[PDB]
């Protein structure tokens, strides 16, 4: 079973944009298999910097758990949002670049992000 941490890296880490960035990324990260994942965020900071968020500002998660953390600094991210006319299997996304604080849920040993809660 893919760990939650590994799933977080697959769905949300791209440390490495074109208007087609989201179309290609959502495909390459297996987020267009079976369904078009409607909304997704990729974070372009180093894995180390994102993992460090687990030592930054403790905040409540959307689901009410208390293991969420807001990055002290803004981070370079890309929001991928499925277009109003996107129809599986031809998943189409609008790519929007931004610099925002990220909120992630952290868990496990090592204590790392396991869920992307929001950008603010």
From Swiss-Prot:
<feature type="binding site">
    <location>
        <position position="7"/>
    </location>
    <ligand>
        <name>substrate</name>
    </ligand>
</feature>
<feature type="disulfide bond">
    <location>
        <begin position="36"/>
        <end position="91"/>
    </location>
</feature>
<feature type="glycosylation site" description="N-linked (Glc) (glycation) lysine; in vitro">
    <location>
        <position position="7"/>
    </location>
</feature>
<feature type="disulfide bond">
    <location>
        <begin position="54"/>
        <end position="106"/>
    </location>
</feature>
<feature type="active site" description="Proton acceptor">
    <location>
        <position position="12"/>
    </location>
</feature>
<keyword id="KW-0540">Nuclease</keyword>
<keyword id="KW-0971">Glycation</keyword>
<feature type="glycosylation site" description="N-linked (GlcNAc...) asparagine; partial">
    <location>
        <position position="30"/>
    </location>
</feature>
<feature type="glycosylation site" description="N-linked (Glc) (glycation) lysine; in vitro">
    <location>
        <position position="37"/>
    </location>
</feature>
<feature type="binding site">
    <location>
        <position position="10"/>
    </location>
    <ligand>
        <name>substrate</name>
    </ligand>
</feature>
<comment type="similarity">
    <text>Belongs to the pancreatic ribonuclease family.</text>
</comment>
<feature type="binding site">
    <location>
        <position position="62"/>
    </location>
    <ligand>
        <name>substrate</name>
    </ligand>
</feature>
<protein>
    <recommendedName>
        <fullName>Ribonuclease pancreatic</fullName>
        <ecNumber>4.6.1.18</ecNumber>
    </recommendedName>
</protein>
<dbReference type="GO" id="GO:0004540">
    <property type="term" value="F:RNA nuclease activity"/>
</dbReference>
<feature type="active site" description="Proton donor">
    <location>
        <position position="115"/>
    </location>
</feature>
<feature type="disulfide bond">
    <location>
        <begin position="61"/>
        <end position="68"/>
    </location>
</feature>
<dbReference type="GO" id="GO:0004522">
    <property type="term" value="F:ribonuclease A activity"/>
</dbReference>
<keyword id="KW-0964">Secreted</keyword>
<dbReference type="GO" id="GO:0003676">
    <property type="term" value="F:nucleic acid binding"/>
</dbReference>
<feature type="disulfide bond">
    <location>
        <begin position="22"/>
        <end position="80"/>
    </location>
</feature>
<keyword id="KW-1015">Disulfide bond</keyword>
<comment type="subunit">
    <text>Interacts with and forms tight 1:1 complexes with RNH1. Dimerization of two such complexes may occur. Interaction with RNH1 inhibits this protein. Monomer.</text>
</comment>
<keyword id="KW-0255">Endonuclease</keyword>
<feature type="glycosylation site" description="N-linked (Glc) (glycation) lysine; in vitro">
    <location>
        <position position="1"/>
    </location>
</feature>
<feature type="binding site">
    <location>
        <begin position="37"/>
        <end position="41"/>
    </location>
    <ligand>
        <name>substrate</name>
    </ligand>
</feature>
<keyword id="KW-0732">Signal</keyword>
<feature type="binding site">
    <location>
        <position position="81"/>
    </location>
    <ligand>
        <name>substrate</name>
    </ligand>
</feature>
<dbReference type="GO" id="GO:0005576">
    <property type="term" value="C:extracellular region"/>
</dbReference>
<keyword id="KW-0325">Glycoprotein</keyword>
<comment type="function">
    <text>Endonuclease that catalyzes the cleavage of RNA on the 3' side of pyrimidine nucleotides. Acts on single-stranded and double-stranded RNA.</text>
</comment>
<keyword id="KW-0456">Lyase</keyword>
<keyword id="KW-0378">Hydrolase</keyword>
<dbReference type="GO" id="GO:0016829">
    <property type="term" value="F:lyase activity"/>
</dbReference>
<dbReference type="GO" id="GO:0050830">
    <property type="term" value="P:defense response to Gram-positive bacterium"/>
</dbReference>
<feature type="glycosylation site" description="N-linked (Glc) (glycation) lysine; in vitro">
    <location>
        <position position="33"/>
    </location>
</feature>
